[PDB]
Design a protein around this ligand. Structure first.
Ligand SMILES: [Mg+2]
Ligand SMILES: [Mg+2]
Ligand SMILES: [Mg+2]
Ligand SMILES: [Mg+2]
Ligand SMILES: [Mg+2]
Ligand SMILES: [Mg+2]
Ligand SMILES: [Mg+2]
Ligand SMILES: [Mg+2]
Ligand SMILES: [Mg+2]
Ligand SMILES: [Mg+2]
Ligand SMILES: [Mg+2]
Ligand SMILES: [Mg+2]
Ligand SMILES: [Mg+2]
Ligand SMILES: [Mg+2]
Ligand SMILES: [Mg+2]
Ligand SMILES: [Mg+2]
Ligand SMILES: [Mg+2]
Ligand SMILES: [Mg+2]
Ligand SMILES: [Mg+2]
Ligand SMILES: [Mg+2]
Ligand SMILES: [Mg+2]
Ligand SMILES: [Mg+2]
Lengths: 155, 145, 184
RNA sequence: GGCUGACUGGGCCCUUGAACGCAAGGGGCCCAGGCGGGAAACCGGGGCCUAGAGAACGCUCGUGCCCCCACCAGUGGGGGCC
RNA sequence: UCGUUGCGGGUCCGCUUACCCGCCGCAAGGCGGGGACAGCGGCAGGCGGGCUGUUCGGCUGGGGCGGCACA
RNA sequence: CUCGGCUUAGUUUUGCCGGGGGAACGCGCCGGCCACUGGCCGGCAAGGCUAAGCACGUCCCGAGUCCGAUAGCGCACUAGUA
RNA sequence: GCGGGGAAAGGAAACAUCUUAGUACCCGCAGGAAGGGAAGCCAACAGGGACCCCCUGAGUAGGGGCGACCGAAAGGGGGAUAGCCCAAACCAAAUCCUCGCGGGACAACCGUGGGGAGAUGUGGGGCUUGGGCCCGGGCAACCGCCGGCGGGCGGUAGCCGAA
């Protein structure tokens, strides 16, 4: 069984000191250096590698050492390498007309802010929510109805 | 360091703004021939990037700049660099002829002589003539290297 | 420092005044030519090279002249609430650079726009240079940058076989070079 | 004749609003602080009594060794409670 | 008013290449006049039913005028 | 940075367009909910691409506490027909 | 699906800011999906680690004639998983396209000759675990091009199938 990296959930000020663990994106470069591989070797072996992470967790190191020992002793089959196996690039037609050049990206706001925070994204998201009648868009005026009802029932 | 607005403050008629002094045809042909003898015997570089690198590094002895560069800002910085580094330079009419003298199949906007093998004396005489022309045009002299 | 770094000085503070003196004469002849004109070389070579220009067959540089100001907002001729009746100051969410890119794409049908850059302004006009590529040119198809616009495919058998062979050799090497250190 | 109680911080009650929901406003009875008149009792929280009366948002002023402004401190500025 | 707006000479005078206007010319360019004014874009003030959106309360011996019996 | 405008939860603080002004360079530059200063922390804009995992229904297959010729699609039929 | 232009009716028990709604509709442009995507990020001194989509955070913060009403993000749980290139530093034509002939799985490519691009820079190199530059050691080097030969499976007609 290929191990999965364990990382700390970030301890927010709201939490007040309660900390928990989660599945990380990949093993750190320090953790991999602890066992004697770089990012290329680890990805060839099929491990998930997160070159961005700075932390080094001993549980991650122990799991890596154990699984690598099974792999080198032949009692385990590594998965396929964690590298791109396909290269599909489509011909681009009308990039200027669809606003995919640099000027179009700047006008759409992707240079300055995130895609989720751009205005076209907000428009599409609210349109989809209103069409499907999703979480908050199933009722219009839900907040005001809640406010008045809370006032009446908690007076 | 040389301020371009004062260096190019008085452009000559019928020439691009980066041409400081008029170079006669016999001097231009002479400088082309020295570039030819340098290519066959000593060492030269051709191309704006290589010539600028040579002038910055200090390995330049003589610089040749074409007067027919269509966007003049491609080579406008070279005379300012040559004046800052105290390297003599001369203008030639045709970038095509400059490239032919440099030995390539394409035009060259600028070229530089790193070492003049069999053209040291001719290079000195050419430098003296360009120095006299700069004297007539008011710019200071640039001694040979 | 490359020659392009010195070329950039004419659009900096040190070279602006001389470049502006040059532009005051160049713009007179630019103002008479057609609105879109293919040019042999870009006016800003370093900027073009940063944006992806190369002097290859099938690469087109087009100078585009257009009128500046806000877009031609129309006064509504039917009933509106007062917020929707304004004219002055209302602009489009497109920029003139994207407008110039679209116009050059219209002039050169079948070519793809790669990028564009501002060149100069006068009282009425703004000038851009648009880089376009012919995706049907063999000289363009194999370019590592232009393949992102013109398409590119790799058979999965090639990548899968090479990755599998690399993984097998890596396990074989690590069996010798890492297992004793791991176990000890 | 002497004064400023047309007072500071609070509470309860009556009326507006009958029995019976319900603003603002107005009146009464008090507790504490500190006063004025008076020998004292006692009275004084405007006019002998019943009329002269104005929500939200915003602004302004008074007040507090007052609270907050986004990793921490400071400066300017902003907001908050009464 | 900001920019277009440049070049000289002592806020003012001059100049033309900008720009504008007309003529010739397929075009290239030439001629004449004006001229850094005008025109043009942005901003700001004034006039502005030319055009757009609206509001024109209630009680009431029917509505309206009146009155406020509207606090 | 400043002015006008559209937009945004973005509020002295969202993104963008137009007019005007307009940097630096890794000993630098950017961000940490008003601005500046100091500390600390996090990064390297203004170039290009990228599979998988997600939308849809002309079409193909399956199912149905659906309707059953005034119902069900306007059309069970020489219906988008006369 | 992407970019742009862009209302009113109605609601607010009138109505203008507002909402309706960046909707209806219009113009332009793609794909079998599109767009997004690889930190000038988020956090808060503890740490996450490209992107999209789903559940939640949450009708919370916040916006607003602070009215009607509008309305996130970080974080957590999942689906899925993937990382790279252009320019520049340094070298300076070592390069690419086309065609003729010979060879070469009908290919790539190799030899040769003509033409075109290319010093205004083709190509090499480089991509945060920054690089260039100098020195030393080692291959498990690394990175690309073609899809020929063989095999398997599935689809586009069908065949058999008890009493
Ligand atoms: Mg809602
Ligand atoms: Mg309306
Ligand atoms: Mg009452
Ligand atoms: Mg009652
Ligand atoms: Mg009263
Ligand atoms: Mg914070
Ligand atoms: Mg004027
Ligand atoms: Mg005006
Ligand atoms: Mg009217
Ligand atoms: Mg009224
Ligand atoms: Mg009435
Ligand atoms: Mg009346
Ligand atoms: Mg029947
Ligand atoms: Mg029927
Ligand atoms: Mg409706
Ligand atoms: Mg209404
Ligand atoms: Mg109405
Ligand atoms: Mg996709
Ligand atoms: Mg895509
Ligand atoms: Mg909305
Ligand atoms: Mg190159
Ligand atoms: Mg049968």
């Amino acid at each position: 069984m290929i191990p999965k990296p364990v990382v700390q959930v970030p301890r927010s000020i709201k939490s007040g000191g309660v900390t928990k663990w989660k599945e990380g994106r990949g093993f750190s470069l320090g953790e991999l250096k602890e066992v004697g591989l770089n990012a290329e070797q680890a990805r060839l072996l099929g491990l998930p590698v997160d070159t961005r992470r700075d932390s080094v967790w001993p549980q991650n190191v122990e799991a890596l050492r154990k699984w690598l020992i099974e792999v080198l002793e032949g009692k385990a089959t590594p998965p396929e390498p964690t590298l791109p196996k396909v290269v599909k690039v489509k011909r681009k037609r009308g990039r200027a007309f669809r606003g995919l050049t640099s000027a179009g990206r700047r006008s759409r706001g992707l240079i300055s802010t995130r895609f989720r925070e751009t205005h076209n994204y907000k428009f599409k998201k609210k349109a989809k929510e209103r069409r499907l009648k999703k979480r908050h868009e199933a009722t219009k005026g839900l907040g005001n109805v809640l406010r008045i009802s809370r006032i009446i029932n908690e007076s | 360091t040389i301020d371009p607005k004062t260096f190019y403050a008085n452009p000559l008629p019928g020439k691009p703004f980066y041409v400081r002094f008029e170079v006669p045809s016999d001097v231009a042909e002479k400088a082309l021939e020295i570039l030819s003898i340098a290519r066959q015997t000593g060492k030269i570089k051709k191309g704006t990037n290589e010539t600028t690198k040579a002038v910055e590094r200090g390995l330049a002895k003589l610089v040749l700049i074409a007067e027919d560069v269509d966007p003049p800002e491609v080579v406008a910085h070279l005379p300012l660099l040559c004046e800052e580094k105290k390297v003599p330079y001369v203008y030639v009419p045709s970038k095509e002829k400059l490239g032919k003298a440099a030995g390539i199949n394409v035009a060259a906007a600028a070229a530089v002589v790193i070492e003049a093998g069999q053209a040291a004396g001719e290079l000195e005489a050419l430098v003296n003539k360009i120095n006299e022309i700069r004297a007539k045009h008011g710019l200071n002299a640039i001694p040979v290297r | 420092p490359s020659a392009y770094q010195y070329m950039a000085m004419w659009y900096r503070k040190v070279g602006r005044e001389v470049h502006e003196r040059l532009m005051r004469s160049v713009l007179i002849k630019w103002r008479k030519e057609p609105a879109i004109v293919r040019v042999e070389r870009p006016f800003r070579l370093e900027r073009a090279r940063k944006l992806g220009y190369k002097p290859k067959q099938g690469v087109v540089v087009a100078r585009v002249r257009l009128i500046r100001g806000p877009f031609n907002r129309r006064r509504p001729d039917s009933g509106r609430r007062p917020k929707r009746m304004g004219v002055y100051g209302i602009t489009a969410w497109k920029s003139w650079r994207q407008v110039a890119e679209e116009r050059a794409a219209r002039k050169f049908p079948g070519l793809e726009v790669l990028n564009s850059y501002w060149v100069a302004d006068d009282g009425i006009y703004r000038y851009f240079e648009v880089i376009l590529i012919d995706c049907n040119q063999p000289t363009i198809q194999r370019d590592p940058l232009y393949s992102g616009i013109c398409g590119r495919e790799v058979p999965r058998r090639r990548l899968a076989r090479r990755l599998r062979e690399r993984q097998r050799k890596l396990i074989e090497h690590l069996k010798k070079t890492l297992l004793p250190k791991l176990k000890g």
